[PDB]
Amino acid sequence: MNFGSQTPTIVVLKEGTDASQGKGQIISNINACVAVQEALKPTLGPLGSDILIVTSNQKTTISNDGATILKLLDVVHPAAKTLVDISRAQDAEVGDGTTSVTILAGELMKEAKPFLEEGISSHLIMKGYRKAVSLAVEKINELAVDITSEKSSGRELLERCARTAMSSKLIHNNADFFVKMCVDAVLSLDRNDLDDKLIGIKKIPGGAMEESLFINGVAFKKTFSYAGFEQQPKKFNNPKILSLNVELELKAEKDNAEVRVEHVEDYQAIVDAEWQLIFEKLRQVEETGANIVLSKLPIGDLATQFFADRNIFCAGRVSADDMNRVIQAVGGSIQSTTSDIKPEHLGTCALFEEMQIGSERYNLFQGCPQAKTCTLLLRGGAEQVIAEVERSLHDAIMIVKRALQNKLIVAGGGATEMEVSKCLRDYSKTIAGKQQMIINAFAKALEVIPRQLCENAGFDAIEILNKLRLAHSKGEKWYGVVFETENIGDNFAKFVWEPALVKINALNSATEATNLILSVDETITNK
Amino acid sequence: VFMNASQERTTGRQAQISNITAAKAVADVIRTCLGPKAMLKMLLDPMGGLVLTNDGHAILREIDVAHPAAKSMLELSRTQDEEVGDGTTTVIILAGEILAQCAPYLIEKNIHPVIIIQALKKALTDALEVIKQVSKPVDVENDAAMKKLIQASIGTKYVIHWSEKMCELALDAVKTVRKDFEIDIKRYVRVEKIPGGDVLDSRVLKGVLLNKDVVHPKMSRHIENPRVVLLDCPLEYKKGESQTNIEIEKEEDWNRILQIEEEQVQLMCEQILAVRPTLVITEKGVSDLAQHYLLKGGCSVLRRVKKSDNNRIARVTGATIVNRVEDLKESDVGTNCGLFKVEMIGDEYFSFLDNCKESGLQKACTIMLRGGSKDILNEIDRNLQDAMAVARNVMLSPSLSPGGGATEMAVSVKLAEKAKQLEGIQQWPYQAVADAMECIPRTLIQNAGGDPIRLLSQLRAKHAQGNFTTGIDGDKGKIVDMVSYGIWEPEVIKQQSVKTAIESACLLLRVDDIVSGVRK
Amino acid sequence: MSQLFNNSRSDTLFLGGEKISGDDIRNQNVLATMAVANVVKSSLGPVGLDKMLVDDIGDFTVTNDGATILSLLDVQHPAGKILVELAQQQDREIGDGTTSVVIIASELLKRANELVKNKIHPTTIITGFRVALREAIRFINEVLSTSVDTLGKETLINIAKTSMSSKIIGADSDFFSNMVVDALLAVKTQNSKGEIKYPVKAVNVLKAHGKSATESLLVPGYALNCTVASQAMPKRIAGGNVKIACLDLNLQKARMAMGVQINIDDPEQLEQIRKREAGIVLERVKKIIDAGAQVVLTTKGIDDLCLKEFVEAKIMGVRRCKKEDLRRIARATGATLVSSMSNLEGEETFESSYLGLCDEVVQAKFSDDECILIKGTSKHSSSSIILRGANDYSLDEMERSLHDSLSVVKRTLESGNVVPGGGCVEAALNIYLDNFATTVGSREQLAIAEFAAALLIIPKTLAVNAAKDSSELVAKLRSYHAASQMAKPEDVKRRSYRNYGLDLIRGKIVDEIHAGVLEPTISKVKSLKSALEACVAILRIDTMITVDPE
Amino acid sequence: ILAGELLNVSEKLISMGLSAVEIIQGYNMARKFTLKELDEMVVGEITDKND
């Protein structure tokens, strides 16, 4: 009945597919998250250390926060990708505490290790975390104090919150000059609409960081500078800024048009006709009195030759992201038809000057009180320092960006995690069940953030936590660790403040990331 | 890496599932080897021979099975053979079904194995009492009753056509070896085979059959009353433990060295002639010089004999093995030898020693077998070892158990009745034992070609009302009683089937993880 | 848990393998510890299950003992050999607690490694373990219970059933309980001027697979595994006062000393010299046969030359056997073992005092194997146990199952004080160390508090293998033990609790005294001391250095 | 899950010698009786489907 010889057994899954189930698969999934956490443990805290990572392309990238660190390395194991998603979600939504979210998400899996070794299955463990995360969020809202109750100034509110994100970066020593920049950057933007593309920082190799400047204008850099450049004055008083989406060229990007002329005399007309068509659009620009001409598409030679005698500056090949940043501060908006240009579409400014830095020339718009945009020009010795300060100011502007929408004063530096943990221990005493050990482990898992603060500072973490629990016995809030005085105390007197979106999203992301992997007892990988 | 470990570690419930599936495949091969209609299985050994038999013992022995759990089923074959020798196929089929039928759970119920093991120990105790109640004792001194008892294992073999002749060979072989309690052993039973001939012409002859012709032409091949004396020492000149290293100064000393070697062997021959033995058997080689002085006195010389045959010769003629020729006396000389003859067969010579048959040491006998080929001889020899082993159980254990699958089905009925009365958490493992006991009589129906649904349904109903002897008929596949069926089986065979199968199942249930290729 | 390996520095060079330092060594030590630990976690407790190991030759080994499992595992990790040799040290000395000491020492390394990252110094961690261990031993002496008002051997019967649990003999432990207790009491001897000691392995273990394990017969005497030299010898000796001759002298044709070279100038001397070679041996056997010895034991093989006189004299011959087995035969029957036959005088002689005495000597055939059963010894009693099973692999497990039961009963009669088993001590040592270190406090309080929770791995692992709820049983063990630690020794009640718990069969808290599960106090002590030295040696290692082989 | 257990409960049926022909007729007649009994057990009949 058989076909021939012997027939081997057919494996259900495809040959080469790795599949394992049971409690041993979850332990392997947790150890994958803990191993990733080991790299981000010393990075937590103002004294944290940077991580140097080189990819397969030999591209050097240095980032202190855990959001970019996980982007450089290519993650394979599925459970380790969960810590990458919470880092990118925390970065896009807020951008602060991306490292602390990974520390909390991995610590919940670490505290669940002795629970999985027992007879408790992972389904009952997730129930304690889902119940404790709901009460932990309500505690943060109760500890938030409105800033308008004291009737303080709105400018000084954004300054103290910005200096907090400057910690752990290279700005901590230079924060005096640098904080005064980003605070003035968010005030230029509209309070109703805040944009991260308008605050985009250009990378300028060379220079010093303290030599940076902040001006409400923008800089479109340069591309070619065709014939007629360097003769035009680079310093203007009150120029009229004009922008054009139409390309100025002589038969370049236009589609091929077959021209058939049956006469010799008629051939002389079509030659001079192209000269009249190009100079017609150029003449209509001079009639408006625009001293600055910008375009997204390249600029022809005859164009720059026309504006060379009139001193009008013209620079093309500007990116669309830069032009959309220019149209906001210049008032009226791009008109791609030269005959449809109207006087109210032109821009202005108090001063215009083009200066060269790092062997590169930049056109700087100055004296724009009505400008709703801003620019940031950063310098430095290494090119990696520039990328670090840019990402440092990026997360710093997000602090004052989210603060204008909702103003809430929340403790930071280990002060919030210790206060919420004690409120959970008093609630766990009345449970009298399996959740009693889970909530106590959840409150103990929240202490991991103050751990790396003292460990990276050189002081012992055992004596500090003992002084906290004795101090937190009586009613206290904002009480936390202070690195400068070496003694733990009230952080409210230290003026260090943090937004509420950092602590609320950190508890919800760590619980969501922990319950996702613990609910998977088997991993199947094909190919 | 760490130590020698990991690779693919099988853990959880799939480790026990792999142990159940692999052990179940062992009984599926010999599943057709049970019953009188059972087929045959041809085995191919790496040595180049051939093994064709229906006995699950020889089938599972030569087959090489590589697996941690499946090899434990291979060891159960020698458990039934060495202790009894009958029922090797039944134990493997039963033990293979018990593991599957008694423990499908932990795939579903998630019942702990030890909890099931505690129920298997109580099920084994109750199963022994049921067998003792359905067992009717039989007289061991009845020759007509022993003939139908030996035919039990014969009905499933190829010798059933000769069963009328086969029971004559098995009854006289066990009765002769039996010594008066009544302990016998097969080490004295000779398996020697004769190629060719007619099976009806084969008969058990007392004495030892030697393959060696007489050494000298003048040696008498016909003796009325042979007198046998066994010698372990060779008739040649013994060199000694230490070198002699004779220093010969004069030429007359060297000739005396070779002259004594003739006289020294002659001195050992003169001491043998004191008892004038008609037949002299030497364990080692013999010189051509010693045979002359033995021929002058009437002694007979033979080829060197293995140690195994020397013990059987001493039992037949009552002789005592005498190593020292000087200590040889008339008391150790064997007597009462019926006939000494040599018959011509093309392959080899054959020497016959007959016993005068007329308490003392147990007598020895050889079983002559005339087959159709060399492989047929090996099949009947395995059939005789299975048939003669049945007579050993009835003599030591006069109790007689029901056969034809009636023993296993009678236990399954009693286990189902006590399963509802026990209740508790052990009711499922205890009731599942009865489902594994009814698989053995179910195999008899599948091999006969009947419907197991309708036959086993009426078998359980007629078992309570009718009698405990009701069983499945092998040939007709009908419902018959073992009283009118005329064939029965000893209880020792049924007791070894229940005990070995249950005790082996408890070993495989305790397996947690499996790691292969650790080290040697 | 180690990723990216380590960057090799060119400024640091050493011959052989690379040198790894920092927290990576302690992370690999725990990783190598949990590898051998997870193997014995599933084999612990009556609800536990053993594992199988393949020898690559097709043969396997099924045993519940953690010592044999770790012995078959050759660990290439340097710190991994400590836990392997710890199990071989555990069963050799005490003979019990082999699986527990591996799991206890594993949790000590897992918790201490987490404490090293807490920045507390390892020596302070080690100091916390040693101070807590000194007080834990004092608590063991307070919970000791001396056997009193017990009927017969029930004290040793209930304790022997504890070691029989978790093994294949656990279901048959009811029948095997009386065989183990009576085995060590028959070999009872006297030494050290009044001190009672027992031999190890003195009880012979014979393997015959057949019938059932519950039918295993207990022979009132020693049994020796050997085959008879000549099949014409009687296998049963009738009559009492059977004389047994224990001899190390073989009877064979022997060569003269290699320093001798025989040179003869006459051919006539070849007859007497060759005959005398066999005649010298005849003088030794002749005086033994005339003494009436029924059974003659011999350490070395005997040629058929001297086996002829044994048949005529109806004397049973014996061939090569284990040397240690023939010693206890002569001591039991009264015979004196003779390495070389000689007398104070220059003439050979044989004295009747060298012959043993017993009731009978019989050879019984179990399956196809034949062994001698010596019953009714005279001078000293003896015993033997013939194990029966379905296959030889089950008999290999029953041997280690029987050998472990002999070591527990051996330590039971040496110290009358016993402690309750089944996770009762591990649960009692937890709360006793919880109130401890609260007075000293300071930094050492954290290291001592983790040592108390480290002993909780034993009771929690037992509930996992039972497919039951562990948190329900652990919460009960902490409920009864905690509140009763402060009790004052009057008004009773109180301490009547805390002495029992963690029953895996019924999943309920029941009294261990009525249950019968008990453990000797010797198995509890020296188990934490050996586990401490295994933890201290591994914890103190900052850097591992591997040298490539030449 | 249901289709996988229907093949698991058939393990005992085939082991007893029941042919696969009569097994198909057993599930077909049992499936028709199952669908007819599901209507009488419905207490949740609702005509709203709006609120």
Q: Centre a 10 Å sphere on the Cβ of residue B451 and count the other Cβ atoms it contains.
A: 14
Residues 6+ apart with CB under 8 A from C232: B311, B314, B320, B321, C311
Per-residue H/E/C for A78-129 = HHHHHHHHHHHHHHHHCCCCHHHHHHHHHHHHHHCHHHHHCCCCHHHHHHHH
Given phi > 0 = left and psi -120 to 50 = alpha, else beta, which region is C211?
left
C511 and C486 within one domain:
yes
Selected residue of A6, A13, A21 to mutate for chain B interface (largest B Cβ count, 10 A): A21
CA B393-B399-B404 angle, 5° bins: 80
> How many C-alpha atoms does C262 have within 13 Å on its Cβ side?
18
> How many C-alpha atoms does A308 have within 13 Å on its Cβ side?
14
C241 and C355 within one domain:
yes
How many separate domains does chain C show?
3
The SS3 assignment for A21 reads strand
CA B445 – CA B456 distance, rounded (Å): 9
Q: Contact at 8 Å (CB) between A280 and A313?
A: no
Q: Contact at 8 Å (CB) between C470 and C456?
A: no
For C459, name the nearest residue in chain A, comparing CA atoms only: A118
Helical pair B439-448 and B406-422, crossing angle rounded to 10 deg: 140
Q: Centre a 10 Å sphere on the Cβ of residue C13 and count the other Cβ atoms it contains.
A: 9
B334 and B260 within one domain:
yes
> Would you call C193 an interface residue with chain A, using a CB distance cutoff of 8 Å?
no
Q: Centre a 10 Å sphere on the Cβ of residue C110 and count the other Cβ atoms it contains.
A: 17
Where in the sequence is the domain holding C405, given as residue range(s)? 148-219+381-416
B324 and B463 within one domain:
no
Please give the radius of gyration of chain A, using alpha carbons only, rounded to the nearest integer.
Answer: 31
B102 and B187 within one domain:
no
Which residues does chain C have within 8 Å of residue A119's beta carbon, measured at their own beta carbons?
460, 463-464, 468-471
CA A233 to chain centre: 37
CA C167 – CA C175 distance, rounded (Å): 14
CATH of A219-404, one of 3.50.7.10, 3.40.50.300, 3.40.1440.10, 3.40.50.2000: 3.50.7.10
Residues 6+ apart with CB under 8 A from B378: B51, B193
The SS3 assignment for B123 reads helix
CA B390 – CA B85 distance, rounded (Å): 8
For A24, name the nearest residue in chain B, comparing CA atoms only: B11
**Residue showing tokens 């007075």:** C439
Q: Contact at 8 Å (CB) between B438 and B456?
A: yes
- Kindly provide the residue ranges of all beta strands, DSSP E only, lying in B414-455, ordered along the sequence: none
Chain C from 390 to 409: CB within 8 A of any B CB = 390-394, 397
C165 and C81 within one domain:
no
C276 and C342 within one domain:
yes
* Maximum alpha-carbon separation in chain A: 105
Where in the sequence is the domain holding B175, given as residue range(s)? 139-206+363-398
C139 and C71 within one domain:
yes
How far is the alpha carbon of C458 from chain A, nearest alpha carbon, in Å? 11
C386 and C373 within one domain:
no
Q: Contact at 8 Å (CB) between C548 and C24?
A: no
CA B263 to chain centre: 49
* Pairwise CB contact (< 8 Å): A119 & C470: yes
Q: Which run of H or E residues covers position A173?
A: helix A171-188
Which residues does chain C have within 8 Å of residue B121's beta carbon, measured at their own beta carbons?
171-172
The SS3 assignment for B106 reads coil
CA C136-C138-C140 angle, 5° bins: 75
Q: Which run of H or E residues covers position C369?
A: strand C369-377
Residue at which a domain ends, from B398, B424, B450? B398
Which of A503, A404, A399 has the alpha carbon at shortest distance from A167? A399
Which residues does chain D have within 8 Å of residue B452's beta carbon, measured at their own beta carbons?
16-17
C158 and C61 within one domain:
no
B71 and B128 within one domain:
yes
The SS3 assignment for A523 reads strand
Q: Measuring CA to CA, how many Å separate D10 from each of A193, C166, C192, D16?
A: 67, 36, 71, 10
Got the DSSP string for B189-232? EE---BSSS-GGG--EEES--B----SSTTS-S-BSS--EEEE-
Q: Which of C35, C267, C277 sits opposite B240 (nearest CB)?
A: C277
Which residues does chain B have within 8 Å of residue A22's beta carbon, measured at their own beta carbons?
11-12
> Would you call B264 an interface residue with chain C, using a CB distance cutoff of 8 Å?
yes
Q: Which run of H or E residues covers position B388?
A: helix B374-396
Q: Centre a 10 Å sphere on the Cβ of residue A262 and count the other Cβ atoms it contains.
A: 6
Which of C61, C69, C50, C67 has the alpha carbon at shortest distance from C101? C67
* Pairwise CB contact (< 8 Å): B260 & C268: yes
Q: Do chains D and C touch (3 or more CB pairs under 8 A)?
A: no
CA A48 – CA A388 distance, rounded (Å): 14
The SS3 assignment for A351 reads strand
C421-450: b or e for each residue (b if 16 or more CB lie within 10 Å)? bbbbbbbbbbbbbbebbeeeeebbbbbbbb
> Would you call A460 an interface residue with chain C, using a CB distance cutoff of 8 Å?
yes
Q: Measuring CA to CA, how many Å separate C519 from each of B89, C159, C422?
A: 45, 6, 9
> Hey, which residues does A365 pair with through a beta bridge?
A352
| Amino acid in the structure at residue A120 | I
C373 and C226 within one domain:
yes
Q: Sign of the C-alpha dihedral, residues C422, C424, C430, C436?
A: negative
Strand C50-54 relative to strand B511-515, pairing: parallel
C64 and C92 within one domain:
yes
For B445, name the nearest residue in chain D, comparing CA atoms only: D17
User: How long is chain A?
Assistant: 527
Got the DSSP string for D1-51? -HHHHHHHHHHHHHHTT--HHHHHHHHHHHHHHHHHHSSTT-----S----
Which residues does chain B have within 8 Å of residue C31's beta carbon, measured at their own beta carbons?
2
Q: Contact at 8 Å (CB) between C183 and C406?
A: yes
Which of C547, C550, C392, C492 has the alpha carbon at shortest distance from C16? C547
How many separate domains does chain B show?
3
The CATH T-level fold of domain A148-215+405-409 is GROEL; domain 2 (3.30.260)
Give the neighbours of chain C: at least 3 Cβ pairs within 8 Å: A, B
Selected residue of D9, D15, D22 to mutate for chain B interface (largest B Cβ count, 10 A): D15
CA B491 – CA B494 distance, rounded (Å): 5
B349 and B481 within one domain:
no
B117 and B40 within one domain:
yes
Question: Exposed, middle or buried, A482 (CB in 10 Å: 0-12/13-18/19+)?
Answer: middle
Q: Do chains D and A touch (3 or more CB pairs under 8 A)?
A: no
> Would you call A22 an interface residue with chain B, using a CB distance cutoff of 8 Å?
yes
Per the structure block, which two tokens stand in for A75?
């993650």
The SS3 assignment for B318 reads coil
> Would you call C47 an interface residue with chain B, using a CB distance cutoff of 8 Å?
yes
> Hey, which residues does A294 pair with through a beta bridge?
A243, A315
Selected residue of B8, B9, B10, B11 to mutate for chain A interface (largest A Cβ count, 10 A): B11
CA C30 – CA A31 distance, rounded (Å): 13
The SS3 assignment for A399 reads helix
Q: Measuring CA to CA, how many Å separate D38 from each of D31, D32, D35, D43?
A: 11, 11, 6, 11
CA B473 – CA B480 distance, rounded (Å): 6
Q: Contact at 8 Å (CB) between B221 and B406?
A: no
Per the structure block, which two tokens stand in for B415?
């286990």
* Maximum alpha-carbon separation in chain C: 105
Which of A443, A448, A477 has the alpha carbon at shortest distance from A461? A448
Residues of chain A by 3-state class (helix, strand, coil), percent to 5: 50, 10, 40
Residues 6+ apart with CB under 8 A from A429: A436
B314 and B223 within one domain:
yes
Residues of chain B by 3-state class (helix, strand, coil), percent to 5: 50, 10, 40
| Amino acid in the structure at residue B95 | A
Q: Measuring CA to CA, how many Å separate C159 from each of C176, C181, C188?
A: 12, 10, 19
| CATH code of the domain containing B272 | 3.50.7.10
CA C318 – CA C311 distance, rounded (Å): 12
Strand C204-207 relative to strand C384-387, pairing: parallel
C232 and C204 within one domain:
no
For A18, name the nearest residue in chain B, comparing CA atoms only: B8
C140 and C38 within one domain:
yes
Stated resolution in angstroms: 4.8
CA B495 – CA C212 distance, rounded (Å): 9
CA B443 – CA C473 distance, rounded (Å): 48
Which residues does chain C have within 8 Å of residue A462's beta carbon, measured at their own beta carbons?
118-120, 443, 446
> Hey, which residues does A523 pair with through a beta bridge?
A20
How far is the alpha carbon of D17 from chain B, nearest alpha carbon, in Å? 6
- Phi, psi of B360, rounded to the nearest 5 degrees: 150, -160
Got the DSSP string for A33-75? HHHHHHHHTTTSSTT---EEEE-TT--EEEESSHHHHHHHS--
**How many Cβ pairs within 8 Å bridge chains B and C?**
206
Strand A360-366 relative to strand A479-480, pairing: unpaired
> Would you call B504 an interface residue with chain C, using a CB distance cutoff of 8 Å?
yes
Which of C241, C144, C192, C213 has the alpha carbon at shortest distance from C398? C213
B211 and B358 within one domain:
yes
Chain B from 287 to 316: CB within 8 A of any C CB = 311, 314
Which of C146, C145, C143 has the alpha carbon at shortest distance from C432? C143
Chain B from 4 to 33: CB within 8 A of any A CB = 11-12
How far is the alpha carbon of A13 from chain C, nearest alpha carbon, in Å? 26
Q: Which run of H or E residues covers position A377?
A: strand A375-378
How far is the alpha carbon of C541 from chain B, nearest alpha carbon, in Å? 19
* Maximum alpha-carbon separation in chain D: 56
> Would you call C3 an interface residue with chain A, using a CB distance cutoff of 8 Å?
yes
Got the DSSP string for A220-261? ---S---TTTTTS-SEESS--EEEE-S-B-SSSSSPP-----
Q: Measuring CA to CA, how many Å separate B303 from each of A368, B125, C193?
A: 129, 56, 65
Residues 6+ apart with CB under 8 A from B382: B53, B55, B58
The SS3 assignment for C328 reads helix
Question: Exposed, middle or buried, B180 (CB in 10 Å: 0-12/13-18/19+)?
Answer: exposed
C258 and C158 within one domain:
no
> How many C-alpha atoms does B355 have within 13 Å on its Cβ side?
22
> Hey, which residues does C61 pair with through a beta bridge?
C53
B349 and B226 within one domain:
yes
B194 and B117 within one domain:
no
Q: Which of C60, C171, C389 sits opposite B117 (nearest CB)?
A: C171
The SS3 assignment for B185 reads coil
Q: Which of C267, C304, C368 sits opposite B256 (nearest CB)?
A: C267
* Maximum alpha-carbon separation in chain B: 103
Residues of C carrying an active site annotation = 65, 98-99, 404
> Hey, which residues does B204 pair with through a beta bridge?
B367
Residues 6+ apart with CB under 8 A from C272: none
CA A460 – CA A454 distance, rounded (Å): 6
* Pairwise CB contact (< 8 Å): B442 & D16: yes
CA B333 – CA B225 distance, rounded (Å): 13
Q: Do chains B and C touch (3 or more CB pairs under 8 A)?
A: yes
Residues of B carrying an active site annotation = 55, 88-89, 386
The SS3 assignment for B357 reads coil
DSSP-assigned letter for residue B411: H
Q: Contact at 8 Å (CB) between A389 and A170?
A: yes
Given phi > 0 = left and psi -120 to 50 = alpha, else beta, which region is B197?
left
Given phi > 0 = left and psi -120 to 50 = alpha, else beta, which region is A72?
alpha
Per the structure block, which two tokens stand in for C24?
């990576």
B1-18: b or e for each residue (b if 16 or more CB lie within 10 Å)? eebbbeeeebbeeebbeb
